[PDB]
C-alpha cells in the first residue's frame, strides 16, 4: 500500500545480469523485448519495489482488475517499463507468522495509474458516520499480510520490482555499456547515435 519508489539516473545500466540471473520466477517486459532493452537509451528510470502474494503477481500488469490493481498499485494501460518478481519465502517470513507488510482492502474508488495513498482513515462499510473511529460496519482498510514458512505456494511472499522506464525524446541518462566510438563526418555512415539508429 506504500510501495516504495526510487529514481535511477546518470549511470550505466547492465540488464544482462538481471536477465540471466535465472533466479526470477517472473520477468516480463511491456513495450520492449527483454533481450534488446540492454542496448537502448532511457531518459529516466523509476524502480518501484514492494511485496505481494502469489495469486496477485499476475495482477501487476496493465488493464488488470482486483485488489492490488484497484486499491493498492495500479499500472497504466499504456505501460512502458516492465515487471520483475521472485520468490522470497525464506527472507520475508518467520516461524509463527510475519505481520509487518499491510495491504489495502477497502477503498471507495479505484486508483488512477501510479497513485499511492497512505491514509489510515476508517472505511464506511456501513452507512452511519462512525466518525473516524472503529465501530459496527466500519473496518480498517489496511489488512495485514501474514507470513509463516509453512504456507503454500499461493501465499508465499514474492518480492516485486517495477522498472518503469520512459522511452522518450529527453536526453537519456541511463543506458547500456557501449564503447561509444568517435564520429566520422562528411561521409555517410550508419550510426546508433544515442539509440537513433540510422544512416
Amino acid at each position, epitope marked *: 500500500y506504500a510501495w516504495n519508489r526510487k529514481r535511477i539516473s546518470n549511470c550505466v545500466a547492465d540488464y544482462s545480469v538481471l536477465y540471466n540471473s535465472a533466479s526470477f520466477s517472473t520477468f516480463k517486459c511491456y513495450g520492449v523485448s527483454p533481450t534488446k532493452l540492454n542496448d537502448l537509451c532511457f531518459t529516466n528510470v523509476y524502480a518501484d519495489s514492494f511485496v505481494i502474494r502469489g495469486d496477485e503477481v499476475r495482477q501487476i500488469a496493465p488493464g488488470q482488475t482486483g485488489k492490488i490493481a484497484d486499491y493498492n498499485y495500479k499500472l497504466p494501460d499504456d505501460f512502458t517499463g516492465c515487471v520483475i518478481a521472485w520468490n522470497s519465502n525464506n527472507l520475508d517470513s518467520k516461524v*509463527g*507468522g510475519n*505481520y509487518n507488510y499491510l495491504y489495502r482492502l477497502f477503498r471507495k474508488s479505484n486508483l488512477k495509474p501510479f497513485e499511492r495513498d497512505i491514509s489510515t482513515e476508517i472505511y464506511q462499510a456501513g452507512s452511519t458516520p462512525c466518525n473516524g473511529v*472503529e*465501530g*459496527f*460496519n466500519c*473496518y480498517f482498510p489496511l*489488512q*495485514s499480510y501474514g507470513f509463516q514458512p509453512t504456507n503454500g505456494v499461493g501465499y508465499q511472499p514474492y518480492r516485486v520490482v517495477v522498472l518503469s522506464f520512459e522511452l522518450l525524446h529527453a536526453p537519456a541518462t541511463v543506458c547500456g555499456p557501449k564503447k561509444s566510438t568517435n564520429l566520422v563526418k562528411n561521409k555517410c555512415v550508419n550510426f546508433n547515435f544515442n539509440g537513433l539508429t540510422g544512416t
Partner: antibody, heavy 102, light 105 residues
C-alpha cells in the same frame, strides 16, 4: 459467520478474534498484528500463535496442568480489527467449543 | 472487577415477566452486555451497551439501568428461554462473567 471448532478455530479478518473457556477470558488475540496483551493470569501460561490464509487462532497451553479440563470457545468480537489501541469490543458470535480432558 | 447478579435460579409459568439485576464492584458506566446460554451450546448475545437489542433477538428482553446497576426483563417467558444468563462488563479491561441466573418452567 460460522466458527469451526476442531486446537485451532478456523474462521468462517474483517473483525478481530477473542478466546474464552468454561467461564473466564483467554485474552483477546489480535488478528491484524502480532499478539498483544492478555488476561491477568493468562499471559505466560497460555499462548496463541495464530496462522492466517485459513485464519485459525492456534492454542498452545504451556505447562499443561491437572485441572485444565474445560470447554474452550473461540469468539468473534463485534468489530474493530486494527492495531495497538485496545478496543472495548468483546464478543459477537461463537462456535461449538473444543473439549479438553486432563 | 466482579459481577454480582441478584437472581441465581428462578422458575415460573409461560407468559410471565422475569426480572434480573446485575451489579459490579464499582461504577461500570453503561459498559455491559447480557448473555444467555442454553444447555449444550456456546452462549449468545441478547443485549449490548446494556440498552440495545441484538440482531434477531426477540423484543421481550429489555435492558434498563445505569451507573453500576443494570436489569434485564422478559415480558413473555418462553420455555425455550430455560437457560443460564450472564451479565458481563466492558469498562474494565478483564471481561469477566458472573454466577449467572437459571430460568426454568
Amino acid at each position: 459467520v460460522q466458527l469451526v471448532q476442531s486446537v485451532s478455530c478456523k474462521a468462517s479478518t474483517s473483525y478481530a478474534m477473542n478466546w474464552v473457556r468454561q467461564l473466564e477470558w483467554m485474552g483477546w488475540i489480535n488478528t491484524n498484528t502480532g499478539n498483544p496483551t492478555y488476561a491477568q493470569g493468562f499471559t505466560g501460561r497460555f499462548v496463541f500463535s495464530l496462522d492466517t490464509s485459513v485464519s485459525t487462532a492456534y492454542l498452545q497451553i504451556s505447562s499443561l496442568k491437572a485441572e485444565d479440563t474445560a470447554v474452550y470457545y473461540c469468539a468473534r468480537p463485534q468489530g474493530g480489527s486494527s492495531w495497538y489501541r485496545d478496543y472495548y469490543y468483546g464478543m459477537d458470535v461463537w462456535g461449538q467449543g473444543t473439549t479438553v480432558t486432563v | 472487577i466482579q459481577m454480582t447478579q441478584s437472581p441465581s435460579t428462578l422458575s415460573a409459568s409461560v407468559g410471565d415477566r422475569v426480572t434480573i439485576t446485575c451489579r459490579a464492584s464499582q461504577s461500570i458506566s453503561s459498559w455491559l452486555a447480557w448473555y444467555q446460554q442454553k444447555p449444550g451450546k456456546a452462549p449468545k448475545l441478547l443485549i449490548y451497551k446494556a440498552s440495545s437489542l441484538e440482531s434477531g433477538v426477540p423484543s421481550r428482553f429489555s435492558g434498563s439501568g445505569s451507573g453500576t446497576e443494570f436489569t434485564l426483563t422478559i415480558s413473555s417467558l418462553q420455555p425455550d428461554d430455560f437457560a443460564t444468563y450472564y451479565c458481563q462488563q466492558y469498562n474494565s479491561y478483564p471481561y469477566t462473567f458472573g454466577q449467572g441466573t437459571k430460568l426454568e418452567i
